[PDB]
Amino acid sequence: LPSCKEDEYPVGSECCPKCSPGYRVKEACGTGTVCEPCPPGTYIAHLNGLSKCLQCQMCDPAMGLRASRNCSRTENAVCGCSPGHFCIVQDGDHCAACRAY
């Protein structure tokens, strides 16, 4: 009847622990869950009840964008502007669009 805790997600009639950041679900609990590392070029930054990780953002310099932070398992890559450009469309720290000076 009561909800799973935050570290938990629902499986069948059970409430099973989530995988730590950088990990995807290998097999559900039944015992807790057995979490296994994100594959290369993917990540997850929060606790995870998924069997998939998130694809990393990449930075295409043919659009005047350069990686300001690299993609790890616990954090996504963040894009910045390549020289000669300034950012015109943002999402916090990630620049999604550049204009030439």
Residue-wise burial string across 3-37, b where 16 or more C-beta atoms lie within 10 A, e elsewhere: eeeeebbeeeeeebbbbebbbbbeebbeeebebee
Do the Cβ atoms of 44 and 22 come closer than 8 Å?
A: yes
Report which of 13, 11, 12, 14 is spatially closest to residue 25, judged by C-alpha positions: 11
Taking residue 38's Cβ as centre, other Cβ atoms within 10 Å add up to: 23
- In the chain, the domains with their CATH numbers are 1-55 (2.10.50.10), 56-101 (2.10.50.10)
Q: What is the resolution of this structure in A?
A: 2.3
Report which of 76, 66, 50 is spatially closest to residue 98, judged by C-alpha positions: 66
CA distance 24 to 9: 13
Q: List Cα–Cα distances, 22 to 59, 62, 63, 72, 76, in angstroms.
A: 21, 30, 29, 8, 10
Q: DSSP class of residue 62?
A: G
Q: DSSP class of residue 74?
A: S
- Tokens 């996504």 found at: 76
H or E element at residue 81: strand 78-81
